[PDB]
Write a protein that holds these residues in place. Sequence first.
Motif, PDB file in Angstrom:
ATOM      1  N   UNK A 185       2.284   4.761   1.614  1.00 49.89           N
ATOM      2  CA  UNK A 185       2.212   3.756   0.572  1.00 49.89           C
ATOM      3  C   UNK A 185       1.255   2.625   0.956  1.00 49.89           C
ATOM      4  N   UNK A 186       1.125   2.384   2.250  1.00 55.14           N
ATOM      5  CA  UNK A 186       0.286   1.318   2.805  1.00 55.14           C
ATOM      6  C   UNK A 186      -1.196   1.429   2.387  1.00 55.14           C
ATOM      7  N   UNK A 187      -1.661   2.656   2.134  1.00 54.26           N
ATOM      8  CA  UNK A 187      -3.037   2.904   1.646  1.00 54.26           C
ATOM      9  C   UNK A 187      -3.157   2.219   0.288  1.00 54.26           C
ATOM     10  N   UNK A 188      -2.172   2.518  -0.520  1.00 58.28           N
ATOM     11  CA  UNK A 188      -2.088   1.989  -1.825  1.00 58.28           C
ATOM     12  C   UNK A 188      -1.603   0.547  -1.747  1.00 58.28           C
ATOM     13  N   UNK A 189      -1.322   0.062  -0.536  1.00 55.69           N
ATOM     14  CA  UNK A 189      -0.923  -1.317  -0.303  1.00 55.69           C
ATOM     15  C   UNK A 189      -2.127  -2.217  -0.376  1.00 55.69           C
ATOM     16  N   UNK A 236      -4.655  -1.283  -1.892  1.00 51.96           N
ATOM     17  CA  UNK A 236      -4.835  -1.104  -3.297  1.00 51.96           C
ATOM     18  C   UNK A 236      -3.811  -1.830  -4.186  1.00 51.96           C
ATOM     19  N   UNK A 237      -2.678  -2.307  -3.646  1.00 51.42           N
ATOM     20  CA  UNK A 237      -1.681  -3.077  -4.435  1.00 51.42           C
ATOM     21  C   UNK A 237      -2.271  -4.405  -4.770  1.00 51.42           C
ATOM     22  N   UNK A 238      -2.856  -5.026  -3.765  1.00 54.64           N
ATOM     23  CA  UNK A 238      -3.510  -6.310  -3.962  1.00 54.64           C
ATOM     24  C   UNK A 238      -4.634  -6.163  -4.993  1.00 54.64           C
ATOM     25  N   UNK A 239      -5.467  -5.165  -4.769  1.00 54.37           N
ATOM     26  CA  UNK A 239      -6.551  -4.901  -5.680  1.00 54.37           C
ATOM     27  C   UNK A 239      -6.030  -4.387  -7.033  1.00 54.37           C
TER      28      UNK A 239
END
Length: 81
Positions: free
Chosen positions: A47-51, A53-56
């Motif tokens: 999920x951290x990859x997309x983390x 990407x969460x900010x973005x």
Amino acid sequence: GIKQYSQEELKEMALVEIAHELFEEHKKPVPFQELLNEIASLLGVKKEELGDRIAQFYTDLNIDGRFLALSDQTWGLRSWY
């Protein structure tokens, strides 16, 4: 049209677009935290990859022109109503 994709294949998909498909998949409005959970696990990655990407995702999702923020951060598509 978002599950048939492979791990790296999903990685290079545009983040708001993944979410767009996620909503037509679910056909239900989904809260911000949960939609990220859906995405991350659909990918064969942490999920951290997309983390990053969460900010973005905040940035990108708030500059989109088809999405809808329904109740508190329940996103979806305004193309339903």
